Amino acid sequence: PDREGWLLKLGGRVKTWKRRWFILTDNCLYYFEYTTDKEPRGIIPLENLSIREVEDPRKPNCFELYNPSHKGQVIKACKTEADGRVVEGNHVVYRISAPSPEEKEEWMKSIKASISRDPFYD
Ligand SMILES: O=P(O)(O)O[C@@H]1[C@@H](OP(=O)(O)O)[C@H](OP(=O)(O)O)[C@H](O)[C@H](OP(=O)(O)O)[C@H]1OP(=O)(O)O
Numbered sequence: 541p542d543r544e545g546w547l548l549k550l551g552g553r554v555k556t557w558k559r560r561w562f563i564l565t566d567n568c569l570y571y572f573e574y575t576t577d578k579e580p581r582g583i584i585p586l587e588n589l590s591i592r593e594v595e596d597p598r599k600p601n602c603f604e605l606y607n608p609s610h611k612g613q614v615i616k617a618c619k620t621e622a623d624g625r626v627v628e629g630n631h632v633v634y635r636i637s638a639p640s641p642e643e644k645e646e647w648m649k650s651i652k653a654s655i656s657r658d659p660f661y662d
Contacts, residue, residue, distance in 0.1 A: 541565050543650040545643065550601060550635040557599065557637070564647075567654050569605075582619040582629065587658060589615070593650050594635065601644035605634040 543564045549571070550556045560571040560581065569584040589607055596602045606617055617629035638644035655661060 542654060543647065545647075546639060547647070548637040550633040553576055559592065564650055564654060567658055569651075579620065579624075580618075582617060584615070584617045584629075584634065586651070586655050587660070589655070591648060593648070593656070596635065596637065599637040601638040601641055603644065603648055604636075605636070606632075 546559060546563065547562050549560050550557055558573075560573060561575050563570045563572075566585045570580050571582050571584075571585060573581050584605065586605075586608060589605055592604055592606070594602050594604050605615070607613065608639050612632065615629065615634065617631065619628060619629045620626055636647075638647055
């Protein structure tokens with residue numbers, strides 16, 4: 541309460557990938573820069589979002605997080621700036637890459653189960 545591990549994340553404004561430790565708990569995805577950090581770098585509520593496999597030109601074992609009900613809106617999420625101050629995220633989509641084909645399978649299964657497990661999923 542359900543899965544943890546390293547994954548790569550593509551930046552919002554522009555590109556550049558970053559390695560972050562992710563924690564799937566309470567239908568939310570928390571991420572940190574280092575496993576020893578005391579406070580979250582960000583929080584992404586999973587409710588009302590979907591996940592799809594994608595083919596990135598360079599990074600293998602990828603998938604994306606997006607909002608199927610509001611094309612064009614920024615995904616509601618929290619993140620901390622360099623100075624530590626909290627602000628809203630600016631992602632319309634989140635692209636992620638896993639460490640191995642098996643782990644990608646594991647993460648997509650866990651995320652889908654988490655989302656569908658919600659009483660409001662329908
Ligand atoms: O542009 P943003 O939408 O603010 O995304 C930002 C990125 O900004 P850019 O893509 O414009 O370079 C950051 O890149 P950098 O470390 O080079 O500043 C980083 O990639 C950060 O990642 P980090 O918060 O894990 O450090 C993202 O924040 P997110 O958490 O929202 O992805």
